[PDB]
């Protein structure tokens, strides 16, 4: 209420936000914030300067929306101060200045992005703790290791992270900028060449619905292709809010399948499936079969039914004949990162780890690299 | 100053995508200094956005806004668009009327009147409100009825004899006959002049309804009215357009009246 | 008020099994070791 510490993971799509304790975040709400392109009011209210989230999507007409985390990095802070702003004082309701804040980065976070963000909750909040953790870390713990190579697909970026007795191997670290936005546009795009239309605001918001609820990872894609036709199970209906039905068929598992081919977007890029194996390879020998025995995935998009089973035949085809793979998709994993930053400043150990008002005001920002890693 | 009441059937993103509907409408929208838009059906303000695009082109303060959440009992919803030039009247103070408890079946309208207080320096009258409502046909004699405590409620809350209730009121034909105006207290009382009579025709269709109304309360606002100004705009005759081109703009004509 | 109390010992427990598991790597020992690996 007062003295409990804050976990706000910030994502591309969403911000995860909520108290250190707790099983899951208070509130769950996209990151963005819109201000009116014209003067008025809404009935009964004075003029807003900007809406933050849920209230910013629905009023998005008279608004310029801004998205200010890309691919896993802030690059507006003007933006982002109005996020947390929104956060503390509208979804949970604190005052920053009460509650150690324990913010999430994406890996690899710039310093200069790392410090800023670290000058903001002290000068901007006067936070009287925080830290930062990397996303892809955090998941891991939530999973019971210290030791594993996480996959972390979100809205805006994947990350390969392998993490040894607690730490991220950052010369390993791969980031494809393929995720969650990239592959809704996708289906989109093959499911208006079926022969739909998505041009009012009300039908192109649902393509992301339809994804989530009917698309799905093909254990053999070639396969899957050829029995397309054939199948009596493939195709689904999926209703409009208007009253319409469209069917949706090997586009359920066309859409996905680009995480493993990111050509079917125009990307040169190598599949997650392959992201992972070169993390691996890029490690210490001595480390490789835990890593092979602890993938973690992590983040809505490999939230995908047949995602783990694909990611094992294709990672066991790339790995030694012999080598003992599993590959760990926990049934919370759209939460990990939050969970994990939930257990980690619930911990005793990790309390003299906190950047204090004090040892901030004394070193500055740069604290950050020396506390933080 | 000119101020109309306007509704637009199914004003959403596909009439406002429309480059031709949109031209259309946004030439009515600026005969008036204040435009009351019923029937916006825009889920996220989208077509809302784009008429103000439209209008504030050149000048970006050529129209401000006054907009409401979406209104009604059941998932049909529309909300109510003031639009008004700032250089020629301000908005003072803006309020939703409590029409009461929903979930306990007693709320008096569909759509709960959106209120705004105006300051016209321009017209004798100084400051005055406008009660918006577009009412459910199938009740539209218990809620123009219902008008009559809105205006006690604005006299409360403002202290304010000086107001305009007007809009698609559905105040002819079936959905209010001759015998039912004895039960309305908003014509009963002397309070009120009616300025759209029941021999206008305000529906674009080939029917005779004077649906839309303007109706006026207290002595300032009374004697700002322009004696004949009020009548509807019958955007047809004035375009020189085809029956069908002024149904896909609306079924309903504009009610204006002139103040001074 | 049920399925709250084994969510919530659920919670405690991994916390507790984090105490265990995780402290060990956030010891300043330790904190110093993976200092110098970077
Ligand atoms: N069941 C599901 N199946 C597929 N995709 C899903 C599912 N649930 C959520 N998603 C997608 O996951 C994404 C959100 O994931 P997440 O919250 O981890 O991202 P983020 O943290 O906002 O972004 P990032 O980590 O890329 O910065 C969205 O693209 C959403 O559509
Ligand atoms: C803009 O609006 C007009 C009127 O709604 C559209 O006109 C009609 O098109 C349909 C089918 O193309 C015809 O059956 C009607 O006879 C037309 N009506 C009128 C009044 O012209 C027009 O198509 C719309 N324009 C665009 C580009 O969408
Ligand atoms: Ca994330
Ligand atoms: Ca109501
Ligand atoms: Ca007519």
């Known amino acids: 209420d007062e003295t409990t510490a804050l976990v706000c993971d910030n994502g591309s799509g969403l911000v995860k936000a909520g108290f250190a304790g707790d099983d899951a975040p208070r509130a769950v709400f996209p990151s963005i914030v819109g201000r009116p392109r014209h003067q008025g009011v809404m009935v009964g209210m004075g003029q807003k300067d900007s809406y ?9 007409g008279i608004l310029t929306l801004k998205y200010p985390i890309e691919h896993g990095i802030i690059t507006n802070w003007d933006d982002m101060e109005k996020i947390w702003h929104h956060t503390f004082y509208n979804e949970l309701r604190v005052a920053p200045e009460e509650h150690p ?7 690899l976070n710039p310093k200069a992005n790392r410090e800023k963000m670290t000058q903001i909750m002290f000068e901007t909040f006067n ?14 713990y939530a999973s019971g290791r210290t030791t594993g190579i996480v996959l972390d697909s979100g809205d805006g970026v994947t990350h390969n992270v392998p993490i040894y007795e607690g730490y991220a191997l950052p010369h390993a670290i791969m980031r494809l900028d393929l995720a969650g936005r990239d592959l809704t546009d996708y289906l989109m795009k093959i499911l208006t060449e079926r022969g739909y239309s998505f041009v009012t605001t009300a039908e192109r918001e649902i393509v992301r619905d339809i994804k989530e609820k009917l698309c799905y990872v093909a254990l053999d894609f070639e396969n899957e292709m050829a029995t397309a036709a054939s199948s009596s199970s493939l195709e689904k209906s999926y209703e409009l809010p208007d009253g319409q039905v469209i069917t949706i068929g090997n586009e359920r598992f066309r859409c996905p399948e680009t995480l493993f081919q990111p050509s079917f977007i125009g990307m040169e890029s190598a599949g997650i499936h392959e992201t992972t194996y070169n993390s691996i390879m890029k490690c210490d020998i001595d480390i490789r079969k835990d890593l092979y025995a602890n993938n973690v995935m992590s983040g809505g998009t490999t939230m995908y039914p047949g995602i783990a089973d694909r990611m094992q035949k294709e990672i066991t085809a790339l790995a030694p004949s012999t080598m003992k793979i599993k590959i760990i998709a926990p049934p919370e994993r759209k939460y990990s990162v939050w969970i994990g930053g939930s257990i980690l400043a619930s911990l005793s150990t990790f309390q003299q780890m906190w950047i204090t008002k004090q040892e901030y005001d004394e070193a500055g920002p740069s604290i950050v690299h020396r506390k933080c890693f | 100053l000119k101020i109309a009441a306007f509704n637009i059937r199914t004003f959403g993103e596909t009439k ?18 204040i435009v009351l838009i019923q029937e916006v059906r825009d889920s996220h ?20 806004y006054v907009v409401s959440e979406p209104l009604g009992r059941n998932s049909y919803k529309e909300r109510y668009l003031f639009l008004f030039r700032p250089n020629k009247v301000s908005v003072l103070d803006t309020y939703q009327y409590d029409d009461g408890c929903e979930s306990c079946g007693n709320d008096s309208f569909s759509r709960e009147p959106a209120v705004v207080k105006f300051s016209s320096h321009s017209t004798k009258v100084k400051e005055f409100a406008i009660v918006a409502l577009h009412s459910a046909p199938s009740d539209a004699v218990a809620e123009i009825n219902s008008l009559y405590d809105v205006y006690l409620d604005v006299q409360q809350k403002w202290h304010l004899n000086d107001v305009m209730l007007m809009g698609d009121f559905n105040a002819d034909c079936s959905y209010v006959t001759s015998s039912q105006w004895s039960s309305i207290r908003l014509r009963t009382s002397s309070t009120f002049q009616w ?11 080939s029917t005779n309804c ?29 375009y020189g357009l085809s029956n069908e081109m002024a149904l896909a703009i609306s079924d309903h004509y504009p009610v204006e009246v002139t103040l001074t | 008020w049920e399925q709250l109390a084994r969510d919530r010992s659920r919670f405690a427990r991994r916390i507790t099994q984090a105490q265990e598991e995780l402290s060990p790597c956030l010891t300043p020992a330790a904190r110093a070791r993976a200092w110098a690996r970077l």
């Open chain 2, 16 to 33: 406002m995508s429309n480059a031709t509907l949109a031209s259309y409408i946004v030439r009515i929208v600026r005969r008036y200094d």
């Open chain 1, 52 to 60: 933050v989230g849920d209230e910013a999507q629905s009023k998005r």
């Open chain 2, 45 to 64: 303000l989208v077509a809302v956005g784009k008429l103000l695009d439209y209008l504030n082109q050149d000048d970006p303060n050529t129209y401000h």
């Open chain 1, 127 to 140: 936070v009287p703790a925080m830290y930062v953790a990397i996303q892809a870390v955090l998941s891991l």
């Open chain 2, 210 to 238: 004077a649906y839309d109304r303007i109706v006026v309360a207290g002595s300032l606002l009374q004697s700002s009215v322009v004696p004949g100004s009020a009548a509807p705009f019958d955007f047809q005759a004035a």
């Open chain 1, 101 to 107: 804040t324990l913010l999430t980065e994406a890996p």
């Open chain 2, 195 to 205: 300025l759209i009579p029941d021999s206008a025709d305000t529906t674009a269709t």
